[PDB]
Amino acid sequence: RERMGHIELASPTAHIWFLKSLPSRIGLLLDMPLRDIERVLYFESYVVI
Amino acid sequence: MVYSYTEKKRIRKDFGKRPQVLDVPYLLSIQLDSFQKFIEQDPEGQYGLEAAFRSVFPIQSYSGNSELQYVSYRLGEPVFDVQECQIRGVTYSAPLRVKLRLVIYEREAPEGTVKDIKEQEVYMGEIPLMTDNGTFVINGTERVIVSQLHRSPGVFFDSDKGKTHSSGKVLYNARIIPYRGSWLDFEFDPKDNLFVRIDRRRKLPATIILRALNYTTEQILDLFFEKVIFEIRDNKLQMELVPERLRGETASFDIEANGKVYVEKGRRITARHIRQLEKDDVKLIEVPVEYIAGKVVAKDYIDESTGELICAANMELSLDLLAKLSQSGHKRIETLFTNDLDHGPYISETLRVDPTNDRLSALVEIYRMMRPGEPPTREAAESLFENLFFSEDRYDLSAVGRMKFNRSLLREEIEGSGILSKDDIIDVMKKLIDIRNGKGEVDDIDHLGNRRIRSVGEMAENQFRVGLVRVERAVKERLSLGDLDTLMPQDMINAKPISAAVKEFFGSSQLSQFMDQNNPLSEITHKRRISALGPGGLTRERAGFEVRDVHPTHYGRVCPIETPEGPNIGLINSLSVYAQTNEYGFLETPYRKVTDGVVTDEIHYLSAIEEGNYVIAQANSNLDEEGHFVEDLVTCRSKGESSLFSRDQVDYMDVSTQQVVSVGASLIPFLEHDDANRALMGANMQRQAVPTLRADKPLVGTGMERAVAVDSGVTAVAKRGGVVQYVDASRIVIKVNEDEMYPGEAGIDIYNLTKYTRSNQNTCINQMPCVSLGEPVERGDVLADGPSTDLGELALGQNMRVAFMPWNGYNFEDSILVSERVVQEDRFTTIHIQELACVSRDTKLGPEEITADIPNVGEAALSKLDESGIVYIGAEVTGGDILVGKVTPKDVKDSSLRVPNGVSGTVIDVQVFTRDGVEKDKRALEIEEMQLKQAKKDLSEELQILEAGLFSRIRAVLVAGGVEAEKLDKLPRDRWLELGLTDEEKQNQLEQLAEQYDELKHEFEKKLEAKRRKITQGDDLAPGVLKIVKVYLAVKRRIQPGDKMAGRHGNKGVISKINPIEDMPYDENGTPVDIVLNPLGVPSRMNIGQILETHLGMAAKGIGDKINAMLKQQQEVAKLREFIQRAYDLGADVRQKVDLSTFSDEEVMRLAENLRKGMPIATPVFDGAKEAEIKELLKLGDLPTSGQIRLYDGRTGEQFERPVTVGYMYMLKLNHLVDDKMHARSTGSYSLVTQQPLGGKAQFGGQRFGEMEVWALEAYGAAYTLQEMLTVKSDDVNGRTKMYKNIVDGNHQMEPGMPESFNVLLKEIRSLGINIELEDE
Amino acid sequence: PPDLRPLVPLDGGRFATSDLNDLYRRVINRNNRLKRLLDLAAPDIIVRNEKRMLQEAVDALLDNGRRGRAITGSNKRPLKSLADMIKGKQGRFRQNLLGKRVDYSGRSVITVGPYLRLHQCGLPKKMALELFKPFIYGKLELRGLATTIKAAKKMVEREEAVVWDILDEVIREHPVLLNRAPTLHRLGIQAFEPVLIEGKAIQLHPLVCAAYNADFDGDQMAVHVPLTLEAQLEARALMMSTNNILSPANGEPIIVPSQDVVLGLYYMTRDCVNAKGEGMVLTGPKEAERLYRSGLASLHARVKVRITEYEKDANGELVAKTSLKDTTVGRAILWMIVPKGLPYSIVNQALGKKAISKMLNTCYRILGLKPTVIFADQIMYTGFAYAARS
Amino acid sequence: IWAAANDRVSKAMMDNLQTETVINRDGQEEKQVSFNSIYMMADSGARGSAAQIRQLAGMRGLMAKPDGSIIETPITANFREGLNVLQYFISTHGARKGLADTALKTANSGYLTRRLVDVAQDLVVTEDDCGTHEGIMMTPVIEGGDVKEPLRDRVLGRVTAEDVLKPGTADILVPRNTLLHEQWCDLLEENSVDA
DNA sequence: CACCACCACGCGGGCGGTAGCGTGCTTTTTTCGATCTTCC
DNA sequence: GGAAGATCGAAAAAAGCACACGCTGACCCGCGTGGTGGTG
RNA sequence: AUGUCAGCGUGU
Ligand SMILES: [Mg+2]
C-alpha cells in the first residue's frame, strides 16, 4: 500500500504542472515567453546557454 | 350507433357534449410510419436505404478502368420471431442483400466502352427490425428510440439584445446550418464590420469569402451598394439625384434646381420637401465640389494617356483627388449611396479592414485560418475552399434545409442543389445587412417552426450512410487492385463498418433508451417522446432558461404539462393526441376548415409556420349545430397570442378539446379543475403505478382508456372475426369466419398469451382471457387483458372509498391512513419478478460445470437442487440460498449463484442457453421437449381441421358414388382410404383426394421438423461462455406503511398507519371508509379535480349499488332495462346515445352483471360533467346531493360535529416501496483503494456523510462526533478494529488514529515531482 | 504503489481498465525505446522525435489533455491521469476526505408519528436491531446468554426474544442522529431518542418537520449512531431537538404548529351564538370538559367558569387568583393544559397560527425550557385530537 | 380595468365567505363569523392564503407570458368552474417558468453555499474582549417611505461600543460595554434613540 | 517438408485517410499584436 | 522624431457549474507480423 | 468483490 517505485528517465523532461499552470513558473523564473519555452521543450527551436 | 362486442359488455357513460369530428389516430404511428420510410422500396431515391445507396453508389476506381454499381436491395425475412428473440436474447433483425454489378471497362479505350459485366447479390449485414408496437428488440431487450427535436438546417438570423459590449448595441449574426458540413457565420462587429467564421474559428473580414469566390472590389461594391453618378458639368458637377435618396437626410448645402430654391441651406429636408421634389421629378441638381470629397468612389478609374491609377476602388475622396480626376478627362464618376441610418457603409469599412487584395491572397488567408502551420499553397487552398461548401461529398444542405433556406430568403422555388453557391451566400449577406439596416426581423430560434423532429428512420439512415461511405472507401481501395477478371462482388466489399455503425446506433446511442414497462401508459408515453438532447442537440447542464419555456407554437403539438420535473425540464416533451409530422419533419396539427361562418368537417393539417397567418378558434366555442357560432365575439388566436374576433373572421377551428394535451395528460379526469403544476405531477406519477393482481376499472375516466389499451401491444386483439373455438388460461383458438377465410387454409387463429413474464422494471406482465366459449368476435376485439387492463380499458389503480377529514394527525402533512380491509382484500398487492443469471464460462485451468454436488455443503442446502444442478421450479427460496450449483476448477472452488441477501420468493421460470457443441443437460432437454410439445399441439390442431375437411369430402364423394354411408360410419375413418369404388371418375376423385391427404401430411411433417430444428438450433453467446442459466423469482409485495400512493391529480403520500377495520369512521349503514385523507392539502395544492372525482365516483358507486340491489332481488329484466336506460339517459345534451331496446334480454343481463360494482363514467378532459350533472346523478341514487354524509367515530362512536366528504377515488400504487428503500449497516466490506465502506443497497454499504453534514456538525459544538465519524468509523482500520472490540467489551472509547484516505492522497501528490510530508516537530 | 492503482479481477478472464497502469506502461515503453535508440548512437534526427514523444507521454501521465489532445482510451475518450484523480468534484479531496461513507448508519422513508414526544423518534425494529449489533453482542456476552461472538451472531440471526429484550435495553438512552439529504443549515441533523416500532418506516415527530423541511411525501432520511461516550453526550447536550428551539439564523423559534394543530385549536377556541348549554355557569374546567364529553354543551357554547390563574411575583414564586371568567367551553377545556405561570388572556381568544406561536413564546419567556417542551407536546396532542373530533 | 375587476371580485367573494353565516339567537337573528371549512382553513393559518382561496373561488386574474409581459385577457374562470383550453395553456406558461426556475436554482444555491462556507470555515470565537473602542453605527434603515427595519431589530443582542448618552442630556443611558438585551432595547426605544 | 492453421506478442498509437474531427455558458486571467503618445 | 511605455481590445485558455439515493444497459486494446505446430 | 460512461427516476 505504501512502497513506491521509480523510473530512471533516459532524457530529462519538463514537469507539466510548473510549465503550463499560468503563470508559468519556468517562464517567470527564466523571464522567457511561454511560447519560446514550449517550442524549445518540444524540439522545434534551439536555445543558447 | 351500434357498439362492438367488447364494448357492449360494459358501456361507459359519457358526459361529452361536443360531437367527435375526428377520431383519435393510432398512438404509435409516429414510431411505425417513419421506420416504414426507412425500409420501404422507394422508386425515387428520397428516403431510406434506396436513397443512401443512390447517394453513395456507383463507386469508381482510382483509375477510370472499372466501377461497381448498385441495382436493387432486398430485406430478407427475419430468422427468429419477436418472441423467440426476446426469450433467447438475440437481436430481432433481418438480413439485407444488395444487387451489385461489377463493370470492367476496356483498358485501351476508356471513352466508355465496357469489357466485362458481373452481376451478383451480396449480403451486407443485418438491420434490426421494428415490431408491431414501434419498439426494437436489441440483444433480447426492449429498446425505444425517441425522436429528437433539433434545429432545422437553413439560414437563421439572430442577435444579442445588448447582452454584450456593455453599450446596449445589438450585434446581429447569421448562421447557415447544414445537415452535413461546416457552419458559416456572419457576425456584426461593434464597430459595424462584417466578419465571417467557419466552424467557430477565428473571425475574418466578410469580404474575404467574396474575394475567394473570384470577386473584385468593383463587383462587390456593385453588388452591395447603389451607385450615385456624379456627371461633371462645366462648373455645376450635377449629380444623378433620386428623390427617395433625400429621405432622412440633412441639407448642409442649399438644394436648388430648375431655378428654384427647393431647400435652403441649414434646413433639414422634411417630408414636405421630399414630396415636392418627387412631384418635381428633377434629376440633375447642382452640387458644390466640397460635397464630393466625403464620398467613396465606386470603381477604379484609370488615366489611359498616362497609364497610372489616379483613383483606385473604395477609398475616401479628397479635393486634390477630385481635381486630378477632373483634369484627367474622367467626366463620369460613380460613388456609393450611403446613409447613416438607411444604408450603412459596412461593406466598405470591412473592405478597408480586409488586408487581402486578390483571390489567391484571400484563399491563402482562409487556408492559414483553417490549417495552422501547414504551408499555404495554391493547390491546397483551392482544394480546401472548393471542398468546404461546393462539394456534394462534404457539404449537404438537405431537402428540408434547402426549403428553409429558400423560404427564409423569399424565393419562389423550393427545390435546389444540396450544396451552396455564390448566389446563396450573397443573398444571406444581403439579408443580414438589411436586418442590420432595419428592414426585416430576426428569426425566433425557439419557434417550433424552426425545430425539426428526427425519428428512428432518419437517424438509422444517417448511421447507415456513414457505414456505407466507410465501406465505399474500403471498396475503392480494392477496386484499383487489378486482377478483377476473377473477382466477385461478394468478396469485394466488407460488411464490418455498416454492421458496426448500425449496432452502435441501436445499442449504445443517446436516444436508444431502455423501454420502461411499468404499465401500458408508460410505454405509450415513452414511444411518443421528443427529446431535445442527444447528438447534435442541447445539453442538460447548459440548456438555459429560454429554451425550457412553453412557446405559443406548442399548442396542439407538444403537451404543455407532461414533462419531467428535474434537470431536464422542458427539454423532454410528449406529442399531442392529434399531432403528426410533415414530410420535412415539422410538426402539424389538425383543424376544421371554417367557410362562410359555418364550420365544416374537412380536416387540414396545419404546420407551425403556416398556422400563424390564419385565425384559429378554440375547441370550446359553442355552436348552434348549424356550424354558426352562437355569439359574435369568438375568442381566437392570431399569431401566438389570444384575442377576441368577429364570427366571420375565423379561418380554422380546433378539432377537439384533447388536441392540446398528450395521451398521459388526457387520462386525468376533471383536468380543467387542477393547477398546472399539480396536473404535471399527476401525469408524471400516473406512468409510475405498478399493476396490481386484479385490474380495476376507473369509476371516473376520460374515455381514452380504450384507445390507450388497444394501441399499446399489451392486450391480445383478434386479427379476424369468427367464434372462439377454444378458451384456456394460457391460449385462445378462434375459428375464423368463412368470409375472412383464405384459400388452402384450415382457418384458425391461435393466440398464446404471455403469463407471468418479467418486464424491464422487474414487474410482472400477465395476460388473462376475457372471452368465453362460443362467443362471436370481430376484427379488432380484445381477446385477452394485459397488465393493468380490464376489458380493454386502462386500469392502473383501484377505486377506494375515501373520506376527507383530519384523523388524529395520522395524515398530518401528506400521509394516508389506510383501512385494514385494503390489506385484507389484497387490493394493492403486486407481483414483482427478479432475474438472476449464472454464467458458466471457460477458465484457463479448465471448464467449470453446473452440478448437483458442491464441496463443504450439507444435504439440506442441496435438497432444493435436483440432480441437474438447477433448483426445482416452484421451490420457495430465501436470501443466501443456492440456486445454480456451480464449481470452478482451482480441486474445485464453489462459485454458485446465490439469492441476494434480503431477497426471497418462488422460482417460476428457468431458461438455459447452451452454445452449439456443448452437451445439453436434462433440464434443457425438458424445456426443449415442452416447447416441441406445444408446437406439435398447434400443428396437430391445424392438421385435425384440414384432415376433417378432407375426410368429409371423401365421405361425400363415396356416398354420392357407392352410397355406403352406414358401412363407412361402421368402418374406421382411416380405412376409408383403403376402401375404393368401381372404375369411374369416382375412383379418380378418391385417388386425387388420397394424394392430397398424403402431400398435406408430408407438408405438416416438414413444418413440425422446421419448428423442431428452430427450437433445437442453439444460441450463440459471447466468447468464453459455454452456458447461461437464468432464474426468475416472483415476490408478492403487499401494501404497508411507508409505501407511496398517489392519485391522478398530483395528490401523493405515504401510508402512515394500517388502521384496524373497527377503528375506521363509518356511516349510518355501518360501512367503514377505506382511505382517510387530510383536507388541508386541497386549499394549498389547488387540485379541485380530486373533490369532483370523489363526488362523481360516489354517484357512480351509488348507481352500481342500486343495480346490485335490484339484481339481488331477482327482479324481472324489464325493471333492470328501465333503470339502466334511465341512468344512461341522464345528462344535458350528451353526445352518447344508448338504446337498450335492441340489446335483447341476455346481453342486458350480462351488462347488468358488469355494472353491479359501479357504472363507469367517462369525463372528457375539457368537456366533462358539470356540477349540475353530478348532482343529478347523485339524486338518481339514494345519496345526498351535497356529496357530504354524516360519519361516526370508529373508536368512540360519537357523531363528527360536521358532515364529511366521502366518496370513491382512483388510487395508484407508485413504484416506490419501503422495502426497496430501507437499508442499514453496522460493519461490512470496504473499498480496496480508499479503505472506505462500500456504497449502495445492492451491496452492503453505509450512507454517505457528505460535506454539508460535516458543515452542520461544525455549526454545532460537535467535535468528538465529527472526528469519530471521520476516522474511527470509516477510514482508520486500526481504529475500526479497536472500536469494535471495545464496544463488544463495553468500553465506549475511541482511538482516532490517522485516516487512510489522507495517506492515499499524500502518496498521490508524492507521485508527482512534489514532496509533501508531516513533521513531528 | 500498486494497491492505490489496483488491477480488479473481472471474473471472466479479463481485467478492468486500470488507466494509471496504461499511462505508466506507455511511459515505460517510450523510455525503453529512447534508451535503445541512445545506446545505438542514433542520429539527432530520430532520437529528437523519440525524446519529444517521451516528453509528451510524461505530460499525459502527469496531466492528461493539459497541453494538446488527451490520450484516447479504449472507449474513445480522454484518460484519467495522476492530476485528474486529485482535483475536481470526484477527486480525492472532495470525495474521500471532506466527506465519506460511514458505518452504523441506515436510510429509510419517514412517516408521521403523533404519539411521539418532542425528544423521541420512531425507529423500525429491523433497522434498530441491525444498527446496534455490536451493542447487542456486548450485552449478550455480558449476561452469559451466549458463550462466544459466533453464538451471539447465531442468536441475532435466529431472532430470539431475548435479543429483542436486549435491544430494548441498549437503546434506552442512546440518541440517534437523524439527517436529511439536503443539509442546508445546522438543524438539518438532530438527535432523537429511539422508540422501537413494528414496521419499515422511520416515525418522525410532526413538530420537527419544519426544521428538517421534510414532508411525509416519500422523502427518505438517514440514521447515524454515535458510539462513544463523548459522542452520546454531545448528541444529548447539543444535537437534541429540545435544545434546538431557536433558529441560529435570526433567533426566531423553529417549533411552530403548522397544519392540523392550528386547525384543531382554532375549532376549539371559537364561539357560536346559540350552542347547547349557552349561558351556563360551571365550577371549573373539569366540569366543562365533562359537560362537553357528555353531549350536554357544545364546544362553542358561551359560558362563565370560575378559574384560578397563577402569576409570578418579584420573589419568583406563584400567587393564585381565582375569579369568574366569561369564555367558551373549548377555551376552558384548553386551559387544562396551560402551565401555571401563564395568564388566561392567551387562550381566551380564537387561536390561530400567530396566537399559538405567541402563546408558546410567552411560555418560553416566563417559565423556561422544560415547561415549554411539555406545553408544546400537549398543544400538539390536543390540536390533533380535536381536529379529528371536529 | 382587469386588475380592478379581479380585486372587486376577490373582495366580494371574501365578504360573501367570511361572515355570510346568519344564525338565530335566543330571540332574533344575527350575523356571526362563518364556519365554512375553506374559510376556517384560510383564517386559522393552517394551509393556504388569500391568494389561493381567491383562485379557488374568484377569478384567477392576469397571467404573464414567459417574456414577462402581461396578457390582455385574464383567466376569468375559477378552479371550481371550468377553464377552457386557452386559459389552461396560458397558465402553463407561468407554471413552467416557476418549475424551471426552482429546478435550476438548486445548483447555483449549493455552489454559493459551498463558496461561503469555504471562505469563512476558519473563524472561531477564541477570546472574550479585545478592549476595542471602535464600533459601527446602527440606525433604522429608511428608504423613501417605509421603515424597513426598526433599530430594535438591528441592535438586539449586541454589545455597545461606547457610553450611549440620553438624547440631549449628555447623561449615560446605558453603560459602555452592556449587551443590549430586550430590556435595554426597551430603554433605548423609550428615549427615542436613533443611532 | 512445404503448407495451412493457430497463437504469442510487441511495440504502438489519434484514427483513418488518399481529411478533418468542433458549431445552444459565464467569469477570470493571460497575452499579444495594433495604436498612441509621448518623451527624451 | 523614432523607440519605448501605456492602452486596449480581441483572441485564447482555464475553471466552474448542490446533495443523497434507486434502477437499467455497456464495456474493460490491437492487429498485423512472426513464430510455432499438426499434417498428408 | 471494481471503475467508468449513458439514460431514467425520486426527494428537496
Ligand atoms: Mg416530499
Residue numbers in the entry:
A (entry chain J): 99 to 147
B (entry chain I): 1 to 890, 912 to 1342
C (entry chain J): 246 to 635
D (entry chain J): 685 to 879
Give me lines lifted from the publication on this model.
We wondered how strongly the initial docking of RfaHCC onto the opsHP drives upstream DNA melting and hybrid expansion. Therefore, we assembled an EC on a scaffold in which a WC bp in the upstream DNA would have to be disrupted and formation of a non-WC C:U pair would have to be “forced” into the 11-bp hybrid. Strikingly, the 3.1 Å structure revealed that the ensuing RfaHCC-bound complex was virtually identical to opsPECEnc, with the 11-bp hybrid, even though the C:U bp does not energetically fully compensate for the lost DNA bp. We conclude that docking of RfaH provides a strong driving force for hybrid expansion, leading to a hyper-paused opsPECEnc.
